[PDB]
Amino acid sequence: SRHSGILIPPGKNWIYVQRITPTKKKFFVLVRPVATYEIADSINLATLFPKDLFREKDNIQLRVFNYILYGNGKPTRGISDTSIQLVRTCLVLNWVRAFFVEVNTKGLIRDFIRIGL
Amino acid sequence: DRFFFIPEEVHILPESSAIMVEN
């Protein structure tokens, strides 16, 4: 059709079909796959806590927020030798003071971050 | 549940720049 761009869903990657018209009587079609990224609603953070057998009700509650770093249709500019991050997965504290905890035994040091309410 | 990223290379250049690629 006359539409400048048609996006074809996969019947592995989505295909964006765009009509390009160099002159008033000549035109051609450029076919481009895009990225087909799925953000996992499962971010691996069993790395945080040992998943105790019992969990008491807490006023505090952690949250996992998915963050698309760039706006819809906005350009992502790539600086040489640096990779572009598109998605950030931050943890939001919601319900608080933070301070260090140090465990020492026979000249050995191990730092910790204690975040409490 | 799905986001897309088309790759395009864009160069913004001054009007006086010498372009060695044809349209």
Place this chain on the structure above:
Amino acid sequence: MQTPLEELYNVKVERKVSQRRLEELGVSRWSVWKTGKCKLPWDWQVDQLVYIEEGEVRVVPEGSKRFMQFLAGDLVRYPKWLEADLFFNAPYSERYCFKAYADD
């Protein structure tokens, strides 16, 4: 003051309990609670019978500067509405049972 904490706070204690009394109470079927060196604050919402099997505990009622000491072999009844801090300094083991009104 002059009055002991046990008298003031109505903490019944039966130090050196005979085995007959333990079997009359059915202590062998009571649940088990144990701890190491730690500090436990608690407000009793019902009476609790505790038979200490190992170790010792020092009980500091809320706002108090003195303590009550209970050792292995003692049977303690903590009264309802008691607010206290329990202190342990070594391995401790007990058998407990919570008592509602009447009951025991």
Place this chain on the structure above:
Amino acid sequence: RDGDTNPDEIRRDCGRPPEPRKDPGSKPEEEGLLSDHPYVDKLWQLHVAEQMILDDYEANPEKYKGKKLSELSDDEGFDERKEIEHGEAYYKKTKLPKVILKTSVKELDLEAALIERKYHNKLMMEAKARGEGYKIEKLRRNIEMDEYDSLHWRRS
């Protein structure tokens, strides 16, 4: 009198009412149960002390020559009464207070930890040789923390 420092003790010596308080407005029978055993915080400290002692054993085994790990002793100056030291630390420009938790070597069970440490190293090596990764889900001390929590939960 001089020895009367606790108002709650004084009123029990006579027949006087308790010091009144604002009603919490919440029914105690409707609150969630408590399962965090107070001793678990101490078990966690011992768990960290064993793990970092095990790591040094791996990295610098030349230091641990001719001494059984169960025969280790604390350093000269170990005060059992100063297990908690409060202080402050600077992170970049921010200054967060820092607490130091002194731990003894004689309150740790390094004989059982080493066998557990060596057992998991072997499985990690076997996984590596197969082109696979290995993850440890929990250790003996983590299991020890859950059983203390279960006893506290049952009491509640």
Place this chain on the structure above:
Amino acid sequence: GFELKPPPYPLDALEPHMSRETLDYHWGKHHKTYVENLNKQIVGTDLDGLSLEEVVLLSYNRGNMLPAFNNAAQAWNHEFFWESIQPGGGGKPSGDLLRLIERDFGSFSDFVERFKAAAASNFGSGWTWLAYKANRLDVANAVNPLPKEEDKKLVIVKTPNAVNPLVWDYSPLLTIDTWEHAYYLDFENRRIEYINTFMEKLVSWETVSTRLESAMARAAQREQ
């Protein structure tokens, strides 16, 4: 409209352990009044149409008992009481009940002594219950991740006045009425003799066994 059911035996069938005069007053007057007063408090309310067990739980109101609770709970209690006894009762139970009794009390003889003592020490008006404890709590963090299958056990519980174990989500299996009207015409103040007569001549263990099967199935349905 709840109806006063008669006991499952003739009113003369419990003689000489429980006289006809006691049954004439206990069932014909006390139990009858509880049903009659309950029907006046339900008519025109939302308590219409529910079973008696539902009415008892609703009127209990988590401890702030509504006006219908005393009539509703007592009406349920007496119906349970009449089914707990039979003209040829006493003796010993068997089957899964005997296995559970020995598991949770040591032996049947040990259980009988503990049950009799509880019924004797119940001060004032009340009931003494053998119950199957498979309760669930309506609070947070109240579910055992790893049940041990010994947590569903038999218990002896005493209640005052009209209270029954239903209000704590227990499953009652046996009860004895320790209100003085249940025994005063036959034993006067001698409550010990009344309790001993109940456990030796009146208790219906086949009914208790039947109630245990339903309680066990109740817990099984919840676990699935």
Place this chain on the structure above:
Amino acid sequence: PKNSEISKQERMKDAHNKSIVGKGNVWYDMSYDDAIKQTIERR
């Protein structure tokens, strides 16, 4: 009030967050606890 303690604290965490995230649109949010099970299920 612009000088109120609430206003000062609200503007403070906006800067702390923006130095991490910035202008991006919140796609979808999930609790930590429900974002751990799903990872276990996939693994």
